[model samples]
Target: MTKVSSLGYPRLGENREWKKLIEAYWAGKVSKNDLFAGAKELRLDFLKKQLNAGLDLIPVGDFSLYDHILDLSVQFNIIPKRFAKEPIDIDLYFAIARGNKENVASSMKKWFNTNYHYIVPEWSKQRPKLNNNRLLDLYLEAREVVGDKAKPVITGPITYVALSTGVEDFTAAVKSLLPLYKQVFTELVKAGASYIQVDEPIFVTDEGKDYLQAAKAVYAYFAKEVPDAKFIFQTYFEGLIDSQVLSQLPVDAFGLDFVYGLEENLEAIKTGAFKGKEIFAGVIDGRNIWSSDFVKTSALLETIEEQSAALTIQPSCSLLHVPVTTKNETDLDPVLRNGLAFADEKLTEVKRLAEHLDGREDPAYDLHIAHFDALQAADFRNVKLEDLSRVATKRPSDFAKRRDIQQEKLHLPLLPTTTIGSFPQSIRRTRAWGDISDAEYKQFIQAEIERWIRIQEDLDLDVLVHGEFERVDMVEFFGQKLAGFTTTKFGWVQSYGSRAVKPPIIYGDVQHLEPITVEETVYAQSLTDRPVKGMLTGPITITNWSFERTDIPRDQLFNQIGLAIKDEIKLLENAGIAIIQVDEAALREGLPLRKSKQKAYLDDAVHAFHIATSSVKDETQIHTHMCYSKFDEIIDAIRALDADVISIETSRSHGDIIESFETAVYPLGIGLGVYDIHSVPTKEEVVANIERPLRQLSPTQFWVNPDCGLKTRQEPETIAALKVLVAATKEVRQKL
Candidate 1:
């Protein structure tokens, strides 16, 4: 019999109980004791649901107050140098994740290639010990509820050190953490954990080969030091190569992805690498919210079963990327909803797939076929397209000429100051929440735009924004307006600490029927003499941040959205909007793990971006904004986007982006996002950041702004930061 399993589960509750509990603690509405009191309730319920789903090896220790990565950081005592005092209490744990008054928060990065962000580990001159046996405690707790099926999961030493910064030596760091890990393993094994899932997902990338020596040493130490410990060495998100190396590791089972990395993983299994070891084949899609194709997955498992000594069926990765359940998505079309599968629904798929492997005729196959037929018969995916032009390939004029035209049209200062769209989302203007009518909400939003327009003029900002108070989310707002898209009531996924996002589902062929942002943008433009940017979320981000369909190629979906955005741009331009900012914040995170697959993805991304903005006249300036990531790797692809001005993030990079700029030859308008938006900046801090980038870049190419939007920030803090940002530009202007 093939065992059904889950790599990990979502932390956000069905009604977002986890978010509410944590936020209440932060707001001082709940005490530290009360916070854990509520957390315990949610934790027990989350685990019991897995039992109900018929999971054979249930996951424990996946729940977190903030992030799983942060949980691991605190567990190993790999605290940042800035966070000094610690009995490793809850307050300090939170302070390390979200900054307190004394220090800024540790930087966050994309967890692998997904939208979910993880608190990056910063190990600066600190030796790790087993400060807290988190997995052992959680496993013991789960044992009472689920019995011996409880499987303890951990972020492996190799991946923890690999994804981190300031680790003095790789081999030394891995060796140092071995004793502590062994302690946790021994304790969990003592507590009756039959299997432990040691996650080393970093092995799926190109850089995984470099850490082979360190991986071998860590596992060999575990084998010698702790003979009773049993490990299911797991890797996911992509196919793993080097089966020769994997065959030699001291592991009981190798959990591999059979969904995204299917063809290559199939090839690896055919080599009989795991003939003596168990192979955990992840046939279900965990990263997306789509129903599984059992016909395809059953055949793949049959092939793996022949090569392996044992087999288990599971998800490709954690369910944290998807929502908790589809039970609350009552608003989506019934047929479309039938084709969807959130976390809880995926559990049923996994169970059914396992039964199919046991020679039982699957019951889900006929239902899945009906859902597939309904989708194809639906009138949503029937749309035609014409060839669109690209500005990157055929521009009306060079960026230099376009720059001259824009500067001449809108007279600005030496280091022109602006914001990266959006202000604080206050309760009144945030949504049509409460019992307020639509007309009342509309009036309140317009009043807010008028007030913020006055505030922008008072602050003496060269460029203005509409403040985006009317929008609850950037992608969701567009999703509601565009065709071939649908919204969910409870498809909320965690983006960061206590922040849950309900990404729209693109089920059909996307098209633009009418104007989306033209009215608000045109109204804001009329009130301001300074250029007010018609803010829009780019096609690349719109597709990347949504729950996309799998029936069509990803490139085609991107181009479809690009055509729709192109229509909105035409409407904005016709209404006399001079500058437009298309935000591509998720561009870097959308890259494939392998180097060979990256160029094609980047090629299509640039084409979609170009298609969206190519029709703009040279005099109508095009602007784009990107979030914080590895800018060095994508500098060429980024420069190819050819937006007249591109404001890329730098404050979190700590001069890494500036260093990249010094070496490369980018000659267009640029903004190096001078201040971190997560924290307020003082006059000196913002001034230093503004002037520092000017040393490498010409003053003419520079624009001053915050690293990202201010949607989550408070109004008082937002006002204070922007005031300092404008003043800092003036200070830098004197030096220029």
Candidate 2:
């Protein structure tokens, strides 16, 4: 019999109950005991839903209040010394993940190639040991609820070591973590966990080979010391090339990635590397909302069954990347709605694929066939050769010429201070959207713009922004006004630490119905004497963040969205908004994991950006922003986008990111963020921090700004932070 499994489920509730509960707890609105009760209720509801979906292997220990990596840090007692004073409970756990006033949080970065971020483990001086055993309790609770069906998932040591920073040597860290992992496994065995999933996704990267010797030692210790527990080493998002190294491991099963790594995975299976062990073939797409191709999935599973002793069907990665269910999409257009599937619908697909392998015909095959046929028949493709030819191959002029024109036209000051885009989302504006009349909402937003314009003028900022009080979200605000896009009621996914976004779904051919942001931008521009930036979420970010269709190539989809944004750009320019900021914050997040496929993706991505900005004249001063992106690898591609000025998050890296641009001798102007917006630092501290980056680059090379948008921050803090930013820019300007 084929076992159907889910790697993990979305932790945030369909109604976002967890977010509300946790945030309330953080605000001291609820008791610590109340928070625990809420967590317990949520976990039980999630496990029961997975079981009811007919999953044979239901995952436990995957639910997290903030992030799973932080959970593991607590379980392993790897608390940093700064947070060691707090009791080893939810307080310390959250502090380690998010940081409180008393302590600094652990560093965080992107998890592999995905947008979902994780807390990076810091172990420079501290040694890792078995400090807590919360997983055992969670496993016991799962067993009590669902009996033998419970399977616990944990991050493997090799991956933990590789994904971390401040650790001088990865091999040494892996060696220390081996015995701790053995203790974890031994405790799980005591708690009656029959099967355990050890996630070792480091195999997907080039660094996999470097960690193999240590991985061999660690898993070998698990196989020998904790022999009672069955182990399945899982990898996803990219291919594992060293199949022979995997085959030599003393493990029982290998859950390999076949969704993104199909060609390499098929080749690995034919080598009989997992010959005598169970091969959990990941056949369904977990990172996207597309429905599975049952016929194709069944055929892949059959081929795996032929080569392996046992087989289990699973998702390519965690279902945490996608939304929870399609049942809540009742208000959507039926044609597009039927073509997509979320976690709940994916469960049914997994069960049907298993049944087909067991000699029973899938009952849902006909519906899937209809969905596929409709996608091909849908009229989404609508691009013209003339439109493609219009995209700029090069910027209208070199950066030197563009910069001279912009400075001459705008008369901006040296070391100019600006913001990434948004200001605080006002309560009255939020309340007026649904609670009152449209006229009232417009009045409230207009008042907010007037108030923020006064604040910017008082702060002595050179370039001002309208505070974006009228916009709810960066993408959704524009998306709602565009054609061929659909909104969802409960389509939330984690963007980063405790933050989630309900991405708009792209359904059909994208086009502009009318002007999206022109009215508000024009209004804001009129309110200020200084050039107020007309803020927009760029085409690449819009395409990256949305639930884009799989029927069309992503490059084509990007172009379509680009054309729509290009129209918006032209409209904004015509409205007399001179300084426009288009944000492609998710551009790096959208890169393919494998380098071989990056060129085409980057080309199209850069093309989309160029198409959006090139229509405007050189003096329009097109500015772009990217946050939490590593520009070292894609600095050239970033240069290719060729905005007149680009702002990026560099405060966290201290000076390393700015050094990359300087080393590369990048010619364009940049806005180097002087402070980390995620944390609250004093004006004095921010001023002190600004000094380092200022020394590295020429004053003409960059501007001064905050890291990203201030929508999530309180008004007082945003004002205070920007005040310091302007003061620091003036301080540096005097020296230069």
Candidate 3:
């Protein structure tokens, strides 16, 4: 019989219950039991949904309370020495991730090519024993609730090791950890897990080949240790080139990515031996929201079914990357809304596909395939020429000339500290905007602005922001207000955790509908005593962050967005905001896949940023902020932007991510993030987290603040962490 499976499940509850529970726990409104209950409820509900959908193996263990990587770190007993004192409480885990009041947490970065952030696993010289066995316990719970047939998923050891940092030699470390992994597998076997998936998707990359020899070692170890469990080594992101590698393994199955990478995988199926193993043919596009073409997907699966491993239809990866579904989008245009399917809808698709494979393609299956094909036809387009006159190739004035004028007009102190500009969306304010008209939105926003201005004035920080109450996403808010921008009200996609954003779709010729932010800027400046910074999302970051026009070349599409932003810049500066902060938080996440493509992408990306901000008068301090990647290779490109100040996320890395700057002796004013805002409870252990960065960087050039916005944070954690971060800075300063 054909089997159905899910690689992983979404963690955020149906209506963001997980986000609420964790936030409440941080607020002290809920206890650890409250948090645990939220997690349990989501898992049970997820299992029921998958099983009811007719999935043969409803997988468990991939759901994370915070992040699965963090959970894995605790299980393997690979705690950073500084955090060794704390027991593995959920609050303590958040503290380790965000750092405590006394110090900042370890650094956080993107998981490979996706938006998900993994807490970098810090290891020691000697291998740690598996003292904690949460994976095993969770498997037992799944069996009790569902059945022994449910597959238990774990981060295949190869991918786990690939995602880690501070391990000098990966091969040596993998050798040492094998025995410890074997012990854990034995327990999983005892818990009645008949099938366990080992995720090794890092095999999709070129550099991952060096680890192939180690992959064989891991597969062999598991086969010898837990021989009864069905073994499926899953890969995604791209097609598997070394199908022969899996062929040689004693493994039972291989999951191939067919969404982002089908051409090569299909070619491999005809030529390569499946080695008498089942292949989980990943035919659904997990990364996108368009309905699936089951006709094409089923044909592809049929070809692979001949190779023996029952061709299980699955998503390219987890549906967690997409939004929940389109049910909530009453405001969206019906035609546009009809074309989309979010995470929840995709789950239903997986089950229906399995039913078709099992010879059950009834009227429902025919309707689904027909609807998706029509949507696909609607999305197909012929490229049209763009009006190139909107953007200029070079800056209007020289960099030095702009810098001098900016210096005299702003009169700012050295190493001026500032935030990325936002306050949390209060429930009262959110509900008020939802129910009210535009006139009421303006009135409500104005009241909030006045209060935030007073707070900023009291805080006594340099480079004040207008406190962006008029904005939702730094990109989407502006995109929806611009010409050539099309948006979906229900186009929500998961960014991380429970946070979902409906990225605006960039469609036709880009131009201004009106001045996007001038009115808001003028009003904010009038209310604030200090210089209120005009915040805008840079063009490249906007295009990169959003799902851009696949119909047009990326460069042309980006140039269109850049020119639109340039129009807004000229208007904002004219309205008298003395500093402008252009944020590019998506830069690192959007870098091209291969190294060869990065330079070309960087060249245009850098030019696009400069084009957006360079239109302002020199007296205005042009500032930019980036989060979630190392700034080593791009430091030169950053200097080329000629911004007076640049702030980067450094709180999680403990500042190790910024070591390249210290070595280069680069001279731009740098604000290193001093605290993490992603966590709930204020930690007591950040004292040591700041030392590594402090020792590496010269104190004269550094400014301090949280790694990113605290708008999503609970009030107590935000206030307490900020106070502790300030205290930690003072302690470091005194010793220096």
Between prediction 2 and prediction 3, which has the larger TM-score? 2
Instruction: Name the better of 1 and 3 by TM-score.
Output: 1
lDDT of each: 0.84, 0.82, 0.71
* lDDT tens digits by residue: candidate 2, 395-512: 6777789889888999888878888878877564366254778887788788888888889999998888887777777889888988878789988888666688888888777888
lDDT of 3 by residue, 29-128 (tens): 9888778887788888888777776777777888876777877777777777777778766666787666778756666666667666677788775356
Regions of candidate 2 where Cα sits further than 4 Å from its true position = 27-34, 85-87, 124-133, 165-169, 190-192, 380-386, 390-392, 404-408, 413-417, 428-430, 458-460, 495-498, 595-597, 649-657, 675-702, 712-736
Among all candidates shown, the one with the greatest lDDT? 1
lDDT of 3: 0.71
Runs with alpha carbons beyond 4 Å of true place in candidate 1 = 31-37, 80-85, 99-107, 124-127, 225-229, 386-393, 404-415, 427-430, 649-662, 680-700, 704-706, 712-736
Candidate 3 versus truth, CA RMSD in Å, comes to 6.5
Question: Clash pairs of candidate 2?
Answer: none
Q: What TM-score would you give candidate 1 relative to the actual structure?
A: 0.91
Error of 3 at 274 (Å): 3.9
Pairs with backbone N, CA or C atoms under 3 Å apart (clashes), candidate 1: none
**Cα miss at 575, model 1 (Å)?**
1.3
Write the residue-wise lDDT of candidate 1 on 603-708 in tens digits.
Answer: 8988888888888888998999888576778878888888888886777764357776677877888876877887677788777777677776788888888888
> Higher TM-score: candidate 1 or 2?
1
- TM-score-based ranking: 1, 2, 3
Model 3 residue 148 CA deviation in Å: 6.0
Candidate 3 at 417: error in angstroms?
9.5
Worst 10 residues of 3 by lDDT: 378-387
